[PDB]
Design an enzyme around this catalytic site. Structure first.
Site, PDB file in Angstrom:
ATOM      1  CG  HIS A  41      -0.300   0.080   2.528  1.00 61.22           C
ATOM      2  ND1 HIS A  41      -0.167  -1.013   3.357  1.00 61.22           N
ATOM      3  CD2 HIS A  41       0.249   1.124   3.194  1.00 61.22           C
ATOM      4  CE1 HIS A  41       0.446  -0.649   4.470  1.00 61.22           C
ATOM      5  NE2 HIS A  41       0.708   0.643   4.395  1.00 61.22           N
ATOM      6  N   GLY A 143       4.934   6.326   9.701  1.00 64.61           N
ATOM      7  CA  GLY A 143       6.268   6.043   9.220  1.00 64.61           C
ATOM      8  C   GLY A 143       6.826   4.704   9.647  1.00 64.61           C
ATOM      9  CB  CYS A 145       4.028   1.086   7.323  1.00 70.36           C
ATOM     10  SG  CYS A 145       2.448   1.344   8.156  1.00 70.36           S
TER      11      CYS A 145
HETATM   12  C1  NNA Z   1       1.822   2.896   7.402  1.00 70.06           C
HETATM   13  O1  NNA Z   1       1.590   2.668   6.084  1.00 70.06           O
HETATM   14  C2  NNA Z   1       2.825   4.027   7.408  1.00 70.06           C
HETATM   15  O2  NNA Z   1       3.558   4.165   8.365  1.00 70.06           O
HETATM   16  N1  NNA Z   1       2.956   4.978   6.258  1.00 70.06           N
HETATM   17  C3  NNA Z   1       3.779   6.149   6.279  1.00 70.06           C
HETATM   18  C4  NNA Z   1       3.158   7.372   5.579  1.00 70.06           C
HETATM   19  C5  NNA Z   1       3.137   7.279   7.116  1.00 70.06           C
HETATM   20  C6  NNA Z   1       0.564   3.408   8.021  1.00 70.06           C
HETATM   21  C7  NNA Z   1       0.736   3.770   9.530  1.00 70.06           C
HETATM   22  C8  NNA Z   1      -0.329   3.075  10.466  1.00 70.06           C
HETATM   23  C9  NNA Z   1      -0.613   3.725  11.869  1.00 70.06           C
HETATM   24  C10 NNA Z   1       0.349   3.172  12.968  1.00 70.06           C
HETATM   25  N2  NNA Z   1      -0.391   2.345   7.810  1.00 70.06           N
HETATM   26  C11 NNA Z   1      -1.642   2.654   7.039  1.00 70.06           C
HETATM   27  O3  NNA Z   1      -1.830   3.752   6.646  1.00 70.06           O
HETATM   28  C12 NNA Z   1      -2.733   1.593   6.817  1.00 70.06           C
HETATM   29  C13 NNA Z   1      -3.042   1.306   5.526  1.00 70.06           C
HETATM   30  C14 NNA Z   1      -4.376   2.038   5.210  1.00 70.06           C
HETATM   31  C15 NNA Z   1      -4.875   2.676   6.535  1.00 70.06           C
HETATM   32  N3  NNA Z   1      -4.045   2.188   7.454  1.00 70.06           N
HETATM   33  C16 NNA Z   1      -4.252   2.177   8.943  1.00 70.06           C
HETATM   34  O4  NNA Z   1      -3.407   1.705   9.653  1.00 70.06           O
HETATM   35  C17 NNA Z   1      -5.552   2.786   9.473  1.00 70.06           C
HETATM   36  N4  NNA Z   1      -6.206   1.767  10.264  1.00 70.06           N
HETATM   37  C18 NNA Z   1      -7.271   0.977   9.588  1.00 70.06           C
HETATM   38  O5  NNA Z   1      -7.556   1.214   8.453  1.00 70.06           O
HETATM   39  N5  NNA Z   1      -7.950  -0.090  10.382  1.00 70.06           N
HETATM   40  C19 NNA Z   1      -9.064  -0.936   9.841  1.00 70.06           C
HETATM   41  C20 NNA Z   1     -10.301   0.012   9.693  1.00 70.06           C
HETATM   42  S1  NNA Z   1     -10.748   0.947  11.232  1.00 70.06           S
HETATM   43  O6  NNA Z   1      -9.410   1.117  11.843  1.00 70.06           O
HETATM   44  O7  NNA Z   1     -11.708  -0.010  11.921  1.00 70.06           O
HETATM   45  C21 NNA Z   1     -11.543   2.525  10.642  1.00 70.06           C
HETATM   46  C22 NNA Z   1     -12.748   2.164   9.712  1.00 70.06           C
HETATM   47  C23 NNA Z   1     -10.487   3.374   9.848  1.00 70.06           C
HETATM   48  C24 NNA Z   1     -12.035   3.278  11.921  1.00 70.06           C
HETATM   49  C25 NNA Z   1      -8.687  -1.568   8.471  1.00 70.06           C
HETATM   50  C26 NNA Z   1      -7.941  -2.920   8.484  1.00 70.06           C
HETATM   51  C27 NNA Z   1      -8.230  -3.797   9.708  1.00 70.06           C
HETATM   52  C28 NNA Z   1      -8.213  -2.967  10.995  1.00 70.06           C
HETATM   53  C29 NNA Z   1      -9.382  -1.974  10.923  1.00 70.06           C
HETATM   54  C30 NNA Z   1      -5.313   4.081  10.285  1.00 70.06           C
HETATM   55  C31 NNA Z   1      -4.312   5.011   9.567  1.00 70.06           C
HETATM   56  C32 NNA Z   1      -6.691   4.770  10.332  1.00 70.06           C
HETATM   57  C33 NNA Z   1      -4.775   3.813  11.707  1.00 70.06           C
HETATM   58  C34 NNA Z   1      -4.151   0.585   4.698  1.00 70.06           C
HETATM   59  C35 NNA Z   1      -4.028   0.441   3.158  1.00 70.06           C
HETATM   60  C36 NNA Z   1      -4.968  -0.468   5.483  1.00 70.06           C
END
Ligand code: NNA
Ligand code: NNA
Lengths: 306, 306
Positions: A41, A143, A145
């Site tokens: 991603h 950051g 990830c």
């Molecule tokens: C990671 O990619 C990173 O460090 N990137 C660099 C640019 C900063 C990043 C950091 C995570 C936080 C510690 N990871 C992501 O962005 C991933 C990917 C996108 C969104 N997230 C992600 O962690 C979400 N969490 C999330 O989507 N959780 C769910 C859905 S939820 O949390 O129930 C809700 C609907 C959003 C409330 C999806 C999967 C299963 C768990 C639930 C957050 C950024 C919102 C923390 C990818 C593609 C999943």
């Protein structure tokens, strides 16, 4: 004596961490030989996370769209490919610091060390366990990830985890080094079901054995319990079923302390029903389930590695 | 999010650990440039511990009585000297992996990472703090003498501890890299007075700020106190006098959470008097005092190092 959460030495993993950038997204990558592994991603934008088509997104991406850096020296991406939920970024330079690596998929209940990295730079190392619901209680910010979890057999670094995303509860989820997620999660920003977490019983018993070796002995009883009568007490307090194999695994710890597993189960059978009244075990007021029987043997025998 | 006891990456320290043997005693040494640092009681036998004369014992030893090995490489000792409670073994080969090192003497309340070693080989890394009584709650077995404690300041490794011995209470004591012991202890097997241990108040407050950033806010009350009323409650339960200097470092934590230091003291004030009632802050049923405010800023902002 003493007992603390110990992580493996991170020296052999620090030399494999690089910076991976695609557009405005910068995260960490694992550089082994001429391949850089990172979460797939990284090729997505803001509104791409909501419902990504990774096949379509990777096709609109080309080799010069991936910016891989290892410190001040760079790497040139030659061939990008996708394997499940991780990206294979092949480069023109092979890592001279590549150790004897190993790809393993761990089971719920096993522990590993996490090397938390930001911008391809190591920040800290800590130990955690894979919960029965296939999540981990780690410490990750933006950051982080691409940070990996690992073990060391002796000189064979065993990579077993790569951080991907965070749940609403605050726990974390990720894949193995083959791109397969731990649990029923998918890399999409949308609410997904997470299972109920249980307490790793065989880990709590190993922690109680560590307490006996260190001098903490008050929690001990004189009675015994079956292997079935204990499971009744366990399965109410959301503890995880204890099998005969778990009794055989705790052999070394049982032989050193002279306390049978079924005897220690009777001690645990009493603690779950009454509480602890306000005492402490190994400096903790709660029961710890993030120490495998092998982790206890390492701290009470001095098992070293390369 | 998340919060875990996190240790510094040990990659730069692993390449400095060597095996030092004098007769039957084998322990660990620190190899920086062409000097090997190790506890001076490596020259003692079993009977010498009760009352060692380190001058007379060292004189009966020669350069070929000291054998140092960095894995499979033998370091031939050229000159041996004694500085306080550590021994210097100048070898013929300088360490090519000598990092940007630095010798510091930490103050009580500060934290550092420990790289537990056995036979010159790293076994694991964990984080602990220097207690107010100049002891540490570590994890050490036989052969761990010579293991070092360190902090990573960007690109500079700050060595601050070398393990020497264990106390009856299960805690450990040692010296800095100049050979001066932390506390009133001397390297002799004889009953020795240790001090009463108090709780590092500035660390508990920083740990409570970490809980607020992570979601735990149930302990926040609506009271407030000055700097003297809270000290009456603190000094009974064995906490450190909270000074105006401690209020000044907690600025970044108070500015991020929008909670004044005196506000968090009132919430802590109730926590000492009324208990917690089977509750947990950051997954812990006890108050944690082994997180400096610099440690909390590190996990809640993303400080990396070299
Ligand atoms: C990671 O990619 C990173 O460090 N990137 C660099 C640019 C900063 C990043 C950091 C995570 C936080 C510690 N990871 C992501 O962005 C991933 C990917 C996108 C969104 N997230 C992600 O962690 C979400 N969490 C999330 O989507 N959780 C769910 C859905 S939820 O949390 O129930 C809700 C609907 C959003 C409330 C999806 C999967 C299963 C768990 C639930 C957050 C950024 C919102 C923390 C990818 C593609 C999943
Ligand atoms: C270290 O040298 C090592 O690892 N050697 C390799 C070869 C095995 C070893 C590590 C042991 C426990 C981690 N350290 C020692 O052997 C030192 C040195 C001798 C004895 N000890 C030591 O730790 C003693 N502890 C001790 O003596 N503590 C006191 C006295 S006491 O504990 O009150 C008692 C009277 C003995 C009960 C003296 C110092 C201050 C604290 C009190 C034990 C081996 C008994 C743990 C040296 C020369 C001090």
């Amino acid at each position: 004596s003493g007992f603390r959460k110990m992580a493996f030495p991170s020296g052999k993993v620090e030399g494999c961490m690089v910076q991976v950038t695609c557009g405005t997204t910068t995260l960490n990558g694992l550089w082994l030989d001429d391949v850089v592994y990172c979460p797939r991603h990284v090729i997505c934008t803001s509104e791409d996370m909501l419902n990504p088509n990774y096949e379509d997104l990777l096709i609109r991406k080309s080799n010069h769209n991936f910016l891989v850096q290892a410190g001040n020296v760079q790497l040139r991406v030659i061939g990008h490919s996708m394997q499940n939920c991780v990206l294979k970024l092949k480069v023109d330079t092979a890592n001279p610091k590549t150790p004897k690596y190993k790809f393993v998929r761990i089971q719920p209940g096993q522990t590993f060390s996490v090397l938390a990295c930001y911008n391809g730079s190591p920040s800290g190392v800590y130990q955690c366990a894979m919960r029965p619901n296939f999540t981990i209680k780690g410490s990750f910010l933006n950051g982080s990830c691409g940070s990996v979890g690992f073990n060391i057999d002796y000189d064979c670094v065993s990579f077993c985890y790569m951080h991907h995303m965070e749940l609403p509860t605050g726990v974390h989820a990720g894949t193995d080094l083959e791109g397969n997620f731990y649990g029923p999660f998918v890399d999409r920003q949308t609410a997904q079901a997470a299972g109920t977490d249980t307490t790793i019983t065989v880990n709590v018993l190993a922690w109680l054995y560590a307490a006996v070796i260190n001098g903490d002995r008050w929690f001990l009883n004189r009675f015994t319990t079956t292997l079935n009568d204990f499971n009744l007490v366990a399965m109410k307090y959301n503890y995880e079923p204890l099998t005969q194999d778990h009794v055989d695994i705790l052999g070394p710890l049982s032989a050193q302390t002279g306390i049978a597993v079924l005897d220690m189960c009777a001690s645990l059978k009493e603690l779950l029903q009454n509480g602890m009244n306000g005492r402490t075990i190994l400096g903790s007021a709660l029961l710890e389930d993030e120490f495998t029987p092998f982790d206890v043997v390492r701290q009470c025998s001095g098992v070293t590695f390369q």
